[PDB]
Design a protein around this nucleic acid. Structure first.
Lengths: 16, 413
DNA sequence: TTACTGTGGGAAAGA
DNA sequence: AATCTTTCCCACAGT
């Protein structure tokens, strides 16, 4: 079914 | 001189649960090799030795006189025993097999890896099988007709990037995503609706993953996720933004970070970063992406085997490890439990807590056992006064204990 | 420099 | 029929 989940976000840094 | 498990030994087991576990992590399909080619299985199948039981076993062997080399667990791996490759486990609880391949001389449509283990002094541990692996000719538009080649939302995938020495795998460690050369993660890939928004909480949908759709990748081990991504098909060095066919096993993909200026999931050596795509001249349904932005996708699987030496070292290997799939009540003058599963033998008994039950063997997949009377757990109870739940364990006649996650509960009438 | 080797693309062949 | 899979071939970028 459609489901509500939880996951800690980790966003990749922009290139140097 | 083999010893039956005693109730004292069982109680000690049940309060500690210091098992030895062998975990085999691997992909669900493998591309075959033609002629004299070797096309290596990728991601490399990985054997993990999990559980506190490994350290405990090592300490026991050394107390009894063994050197470090004699107590070192050793492993070899091969494909359907058609010759095995040695793995190196020294200094680590895992090893990867990076040069396995399968020749078209092998006609099998499916196979299993065999991992053969033993200690450095050659004491046998046994042979452990992976889950079934499907041979494919090469990666494929693909039809939903072959769901084994498609990728259902909510299943696990590995992701790798090739620049054979360059190969890196998406992996999470030290609280960050990175591109590892030594380990690979298995990530849930979840379909999201086109209009679902970023957040720690989000709604996922069922269905097969198609290019153009929005997905969340969630580490199966740490539970950490990347931002919303649009999975796109890759042709040579370009993302095709208009592609919308099903994602298939061992396809090259790109992951566009949704709501960014053409930023794609990209590696820079071990680092995971975002990197901006280059728009294409006359073909504006295409974007040119960094070489570190191209990822190969493949569904993964794992096999898990758990055992414990309840009466100390034994002569026989602990395998084949019996596995209980289901329990069912069963009726007569007293209650009985039907066990279904695999690798049962006539030398196994079912234990309920520290009580060994009368156990009958029907075949490798079926045992029947008699539920002990409640008074074996609660002194004097002539009926079930209150609910009492006890663990279900399989035990071999030389004292090897095979943990199950099953319980039995006595329930008042 | 030549030989060899996984890998990835594409053509030819068979399903 | 027509498309799809399987096999075969070979260039690329490194030992």
């Amino acid at each position: 079914d459609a489901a509500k989940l939880r996951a800690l976000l980790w966003t990749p840094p922009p290139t140097p | 001189p083999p010893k039956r498990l005693t109730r004292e030994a069982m109680r000690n087991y049940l309060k500690e649960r210091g098992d030895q576990t062998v975990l085999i992590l691997h992909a669900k399909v493998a591309q075959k090799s033609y002629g004299n080619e070797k096309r290596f299985f990728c991601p490399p199948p990985c054997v993990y030795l999990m559980g506190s039981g490994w350290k405990k076993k090592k300490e026991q062997m050394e107390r009894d006189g063994c050197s470090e080399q004699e107590s070192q667990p050793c492993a070899f791996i091969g494909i359907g025993n058609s010759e095995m490759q040695q793995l190196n486990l020294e200094g680590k609880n895992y090893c990867t097999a990076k040069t396995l391949y399968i020749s078209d001389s092998d006609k099998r449509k499916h196979f299993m890896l065999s991992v053969k283990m033993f200690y450095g002094n050659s004491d046998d541990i046994g042979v452990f099988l992976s889950k079934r692996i499907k041979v494919i000719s090469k990666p494929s538009k693909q039809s939903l007709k072959n769901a084994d080649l498609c990728i259902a939302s909510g299943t696990k995938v590995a992701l790798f990037n090739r620049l054979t020495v360059s190969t890196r795998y998406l992996h999470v460690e030290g609280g960050n995503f990175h591109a590892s050369s030594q380990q690979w993660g298995a990530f849930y890939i979840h379909l999201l609706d086109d209009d679902e928004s970023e957040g720690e909480e989000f709604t996922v949908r069922d269905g097969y993953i198609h290019y153009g759709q929005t997905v969340k990748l969630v580490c199966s081990v740490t539970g950490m996720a990347l931002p919303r991504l649009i999975i796109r098909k890759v042709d040579k060095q370009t993302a095709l933004l208009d592609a919308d066919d099903p994602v298939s096993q061992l396809h090259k993909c790109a992951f566009y970070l949704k709501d960014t200026e053409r930023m794609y999931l990209c590696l820079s050596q071990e680092r995971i970063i975002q990197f901006q795509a280059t728009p294409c001249p006359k073909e504006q349904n295409k974007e040119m992406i960094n070489d570190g932005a191209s990822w190969t996708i493949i569904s993964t699987d794992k096999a898990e085997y758990t055992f414990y030496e309840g009466m100390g070292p034994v002569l026989a290997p602990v395998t084949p490890v019996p596995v209980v799939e289901s329990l069912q009540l069963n009726g007569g003058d007293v209650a009985m439990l039907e066990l279904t599963g695999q690798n049962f033998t006539p030398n196994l008994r079912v234990w309920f807590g520290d009580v060994e039950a009368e156990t009958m063997y029907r075949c490798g997949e079926s045992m029947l056992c008699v539920v002990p009377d409640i008074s074996a757990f609660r002194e004097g109870w002539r009926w079930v006064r209150q609910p009492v739940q006890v663990p279900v364990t399989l035990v071999r006649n030389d004292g090897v204990i095979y943990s199950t996650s099953l319980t039995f509960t006595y329930t008042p009438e």
